[PDB]
Amino acid sequence: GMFAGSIPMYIRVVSITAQSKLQFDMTVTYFENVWSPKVISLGAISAEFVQSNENSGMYIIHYPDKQTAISVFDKIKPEVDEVRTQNRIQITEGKRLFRVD
Amino acid sequence: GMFAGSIPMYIRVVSITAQSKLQFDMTVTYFENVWSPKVISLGAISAEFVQSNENSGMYIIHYPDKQTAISVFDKIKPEVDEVRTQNRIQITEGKRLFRVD
Ligand SMILES: [Cl-]
Ligand SMILES: [Cl-]
Ligand SMILES: [Cl-]
Ligand SMILES: [Cl-]
């Protein structure tokens, strides 16, 4: 937010494909208002959602380190499993090798 | 001008998988030293690389808007072609729907 804080050295990217455009839209609203605040409260630095097509996108979460990422994921795995029931989810994650700006 | 809506950031993700560690490492070095400085000079805000597995990762580029993102992409076909020679790639891109931090 207002502080630079930890350098985000670990990133998790969730690709999310919903069953329709309107279901996708509702999911994004849910990820903005409930999910992203929750993971930030648990240690995430930031979360962004990028739209790929009408019913799918990428949810990108930045973490200070792998350990924080693991911590959060462990805490929310039951909610993730529920998300997988309605959606096609693929999670890809790892360490930041470089950032240029 | 007055009634122009907000213009969202636009994100491009170039995901790569290489057949060997050498090709992966060469690709990372190419994103860092050739692709990044070029796109940043032409209007990208930032570029980072995230290693997702032994020989795979994501190159994530943030642009101020879609127009800039598309215009730059059209000018770096040589760079895309060079990365394609050494890797399986998938490019996914879109407007940012939200960022929470
Ligand atoms: Cl997460
Ligand atoms: Cl997965
Ligand atoms: Cl690009
Ligand atoms: Cl292939």
Please explain how this structure is put together.
2 copies of one chain form a homodimer. Chain A contains 2 helices and 4 strands, in the order βαββαβ. By secondary structure, chain A is of the alpha+beta class. Chain A has a single domain (8-95), classed as 2-Layer Sandwich (Alpha-Beta Plaits). Chain A has a 4-stranded antiparallel sheet, covered by helices on one side. In chain A, β2 and β3 (56-63) form a beta hairpin. The first copy, chain A, is globular and about 35 Å long. In chain A, 30% of the residues are buried. Chain A binds chain B through residues 1, 11, 13, 15, 28, 31-32, 36-37, 40, 45-53, 57-58, 60, 92-101, and chain B through 11, 13, 15, 28, 31-32, 36-37, 40, 45-53, 57-58, 60, 92-101. β4 of chain A pairs antiparallel with β2 of chain B. The complex binds chloride ion (4 copies). Residues 12, 39, 61, 72-73 of chain B line the site of one chloride ion. One chloride ion (CL) binds at residues 89-91 of chain A. It is classed as unknown function. Keywords: Metagenomics target, structural genomics, Joint Center for Structural Genomics, jcsg, Protein Structure Initiative, PSI-2, unknown function. It forms a dimeric assembly. The entry is titled "Crystal structure of a dimeric ferredoxin-like protein (jcvi_pep_1096665735785) from uncultured marine organism at 1.70 A resolution".
